[PDB]
C-alpha cells in the first residue's frame, strides 16, 4: 500500500514471471506453486544476512540494486504482512546465529531460527516436516524426503493457501471426472462446478481461454489460463508475460461462464537453490564463495518453497447460454491483489493427485 511496498511489489512480481519460466523449462518439474512475495523475502534475507557480492547479487535478482537496504527490508516486510505461512532458517549444530540478524530477520521477514544435526538424516527430516505440519495445521505434512546438502544453511518456507471465492460453489456441485494429463493419460479426479458472471476472454487465434475468478470482497482474483484442448503448457508459457497478461485482462468482458475445476489439495515442494543461481544468485549458493557473516559461522544449501494449495467449493454466500471453462487438462493460474496488482501466487496444474 505505502510507496516503499508498492515499488517493491512490482519487482517481486517481475521476479515471479522470471522464476516461473525457469522452473517451467526444467523437465523434472510437474506442478508449480510459487508465492512471489515469499520468494522475494528469501532474497531479502540473503541481502540482510550477507556481505559484498553475496548481498549485492540478492538485490540484483530483486532488481533492487539502486534501493537502500532499509527500503528493501521495510518494503518487503510490509508486503509480506486462508493463508498460513512459516519461514525458518536451519543451520548446522556447529553454527550460531547473530543477535542483530535474529532481531531484524524476525522484524522484517518473520523469520524463525533453528540448529540442526544431520548425523541422523531421519531426525533432521522429522524436525523440518513436523515444523511444516504445525505451521500449516497438517495441510502440508511433509516438505522433503531428502536433504542433498547437509553442510550449509537450509531456508524453509511452508505454506497453506485456500482461495475463498467471492461467489461460492454449491457443496453438492462436486462429482468424479477424468483429468487429461496427456491425450493418452487420464487420471480420476474430483471436480467442482459453477455457472456465473465472470470476466472472460476466448483467444481463438492463440487457442486459449482466460477467466478471472474474484476472491472474497473482490480484494483479489484468481486468474486461470488454459489452452482449448489437451496439450503441454510449453506453448502457452511462451505467451505468458506481464505485458501479454495486461492485453488479455483488457480484452476480457463479463460473460456467463460454467467453470469446472479439479477439487482438492495440491502439494508442491520446490528447491529454489539452482533456479535463483540461474537468475543471478551465484555467490550465496557456493560454499567457497558465500559470505553470510551477518548471520555468522555458512552458505545457502537449499531454499525450500513448499505449498499446500487447496481448491475447494467454499466462498461468500437471467444469464445467457454459458461458455464452458472445463479445466480437465493442464492450466496456468495466478492470484492477484485487485488494488496493487501484486502477485500472491503463480503456478500450474499439470498432474493432480486423484
Amino acid at each position: 500500500l505505502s510507496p516503499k511496498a508498492a515499488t517493491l511489489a512490482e519487482r517481486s512480481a517481475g521476479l515471479a514471471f522470471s522464476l516461473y519460466q525457469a522452473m517451467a523449462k526444467d523437465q523434472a518439474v510437474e506442478n508449480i506453486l510459487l508465492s512471489p512475495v515469499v520468494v522475494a523475502s528469501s532474497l531479502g534475507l540473503v541481502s540482510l544476512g550477507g556481505k559484498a557480492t553475496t548481498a549485492s547479487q540478492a538485490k540484483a535478482v530483486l532488481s533492487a540494486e539502486q534501493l537502500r537496504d532499509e527500503e528493501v527490508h521495510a518494503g518487503l516486510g510490509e508486503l509480506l504482512r486462508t493463508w498460513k505461512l512459516g519461514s525458518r532458517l536451519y543451520g548446522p549444530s556447529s553454527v550460531s546465529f547473530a543477535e542483530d540478524f535474529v532481531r531484524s530477520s524476525k522484524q522484517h521477514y518473520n523469520c524463525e531460527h533453528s540448529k540442526i544435526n544431520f548425523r541422523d538424516k531421519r531426525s533432521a527430516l522429522q524436525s523440518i516436516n513436523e515444523w511444516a505440519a504445525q505451521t500449516t495445521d497438517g495441510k502440508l505434512p511433509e516438505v522433503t524426503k531428502d536433504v542433498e546438502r547437509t553442510d550449509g544453511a537450509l531456508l524453509v518456507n511452508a505454506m497453506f493457501f485456500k482461495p475463498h471465492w467471492d461467489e461460492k460453489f454449491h457443496h453438492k456441485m462436486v462429482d468424479n471426472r477424468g483429468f487429461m494429463v496427456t491425450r493418452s493419460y487420464t487420471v480420476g479426479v474430483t471436480m467442482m462446478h459453477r455457472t456465473g458472471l465472470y470476466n472472460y476472454y476466448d483467444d481463438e487465434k492463440e487457442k486459449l481461454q482466460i477467466v478471472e475468478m474474484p476472491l472474497a470482497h473482490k480484494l483479489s482474483s484468481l486468474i486461470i489460463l488454459m489452452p482449448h484442448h489437451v496439450e503441454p503448457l510449453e506453448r502457452l508459457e511462451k505467451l505468458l508475460t506481464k505485458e501479454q497478461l495486461k492485453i488479455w485482462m483488457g480484452k476480457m468482458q463479463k460473460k456467463a461462464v460454467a467453470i469446472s475445476l479439479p477439487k482438492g489439495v495440491v502439494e508442491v515442494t520446490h528447491d529454489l537453490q539452482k533456479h535463483l543461481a540461474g537468475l543471478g544468485l551465484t555467490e550465496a549458493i557456493d560454499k567457497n564463495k558465500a559470505d553470510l557473516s551477518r548471520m555468522s559461522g555458512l552458505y545457502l544449501a537449499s531454499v525450500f518453497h513448499a505449498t499446500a494449495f487447496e481448491w475447494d467449493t467454499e466462498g461468500n454466500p437471467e444469464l445467457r447460454s454459458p461458455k464452458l471453462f472445463y479445466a480437465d487438462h493442464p492450466f496456468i493460474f495466478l492470484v492477484r491483489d485487485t488494488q496493487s496488482g501484486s502477485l500472491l501466487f503463480i503456478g500450474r496444474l499439470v498432474r493432480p493427485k486423484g
Partner: peptide, 13 residues
Amino acid sequence: PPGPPGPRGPPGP
C-alpha cells in the same frame, strides 16, 4: 440450480 455440465465428448478418429 442446474446440474454440472456433462463429461467431455470422445476424441476424434
